[PDB]
Point group: C2
């Protein structure tokens, strides 16, 4: 049955709530496992098969003299001592299930930059990555290219197909909803909207997502909502489509 | 005299030690101001003109019930209430000095993603960004393209020339020192080293920094060391060169 979905997203994207809700959505026609890799998240809305807080939490470490930024890094360093264990735990789940959903660190960068996250990921069988954004980071043509770009970066970094998505689209007025898809799905509209800006940066910014766009056929952005279950069917089949075309 | 240098880098890059040391290096032929924007860093090796911890620290906030990841975000939300104040504080320093050095959050992403960092930056006069990496993230041809890429991303994000650099090169055996420059400065060697990898990712990865490379003449990577002062003269003149060509 075997299939892994990694939720990546920055502090305040609501991806722990998504991981939870998307699981129950799956729990109806599928066996599902939940993996928590975040050492500093308080509560979790699901039942974890693997929960690294058992082994170490950011606070325990602070309760030993570390500045907050230094205690996240230090939680991930200690995790690596159980590196092989956690890998093999995950590999077991992978083929005892249809879906293993993986919830990554809230500081996205202790997943991009620390050894644990990075090595873990590059030793899993063709995992699917979902990069979710608060659609608020989306104010103007600039905000849109950065998101495609950063998804490309994560992909590069983890060596895993990374699909970009917006979460909490149920909070969007159709006003905004309209505005975002246009900019996202009509490549040759945004790719041309990046010229009405005449400044050191209102020019480069244009030749940026201009190429990345002309190399490997870009991806569809997912619109998701833990609250309405908008987009679950889509991601469901993107998962399956991914399991095929690999 | 006016000139701003923003040090960006992830938890464990040693850029607070760099900001400190590069300042004294400058303090000999220049008037210099130090700006700390990190709410969770304990001690600082310099004298801050602006220190946001006066107004709020990550711990005070934790001492009120926030999970660590939620207390960084919450420190930056409260900062934005003094947004205009901090902007004007910085603008005053800018032309009371030759250099204002700015030390950004240790969680690089509360600078890329929160409103404070991002808006602050895009309202400063042509600031220079220095992206520093622990050269350990550098193991193989992949690690190298990601770094160029991510510097491009920051640049895009903040609308500021962003220069990539390695810090702590004094810890490098000449063995490694040799190895990194080759991969970094001989474009058409790494840009061709990205083909001896035959896998979903050992192929895309090649067409990645292949284009970005063919659009706008790439940048020289700086090798820096707070401990030996390797690279200071270089960055010094890159600062000046930047102040010119703008
Ligand atoms: N309206 C709406 N609210 C949501 C949705 N998803 C999450 N929320 C709310 O926003 C909060 C997000 O919480 P989490 O899912 O834990 O966020 P997170 O991504 O784990 O946060 P970090 O760990 O910092 O990355 C929840 O408490 C929900 O109340 C959504 O789809 N729609
Ligand atoms: N050998 C050597 N050691 C260094 C150098 N720079 C910093 N260090 C050491 O590494 C540590 C880095 O500390 P910081 O400069 O505060 O690191 P930082 O970038 O502020 O860390 P974050 O806030 O998490 O991003 C220091 O305590 C130094 O002892 C260097 O250039 N060479």
């Amino acid at each position: 049955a075997s299939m892994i979905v990694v939720f990546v997203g920055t502090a305040g994207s609501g991806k722990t709530t998504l991981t939870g809700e998307f699981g129950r959505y799956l729990e109806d026609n599928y066996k599902v496992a939940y993996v928590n890799l975040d050492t500093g998240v308080k509560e979790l809305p699901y039942e974890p098969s693997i929960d690294v807080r058992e082994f170490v939490t950011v606070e325990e470490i602070m309760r030993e003299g570390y500045g907050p930024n230094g205690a996240i890094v230090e939680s991930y360093d200690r995790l690596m001592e159980k590196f092989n264990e956690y890998l093999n735990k995950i590999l077991r789940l992978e083929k005892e299930n249809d879906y293993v959903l993986i919830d990554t660190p809230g500081q996205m960068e202790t997943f991009l930059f620390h050894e644990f996250g990075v090595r873990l990921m590059e030793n899993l069988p063709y995992p699917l990555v979902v990069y979710i954004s608060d659609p608020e980071i989306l104010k103007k043509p600039n905000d849109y290219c950065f998101v495609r770009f950063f998804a490309l970066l994560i992909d590069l970094r983890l060596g895993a197909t990374t699909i970009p998505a917006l979460n909490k689209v149920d909070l969007l007025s159709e006003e905004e909803k309209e505005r975002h898809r246009k900019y996202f799905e009509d490549i040759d509209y945004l790719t041309a909207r990046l010229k009405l800006d005449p400044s050191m940066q209102g020019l480069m910014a244009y030749k940026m997502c201009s190429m990345m766009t002309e190399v490997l056929p870009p991806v569809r952005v997912l619109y998701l909502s833990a609250k309405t279950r908008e987009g679950f069917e889509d991601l469901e089949t993107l998962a399956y489509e991914h399991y095929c075309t690999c």
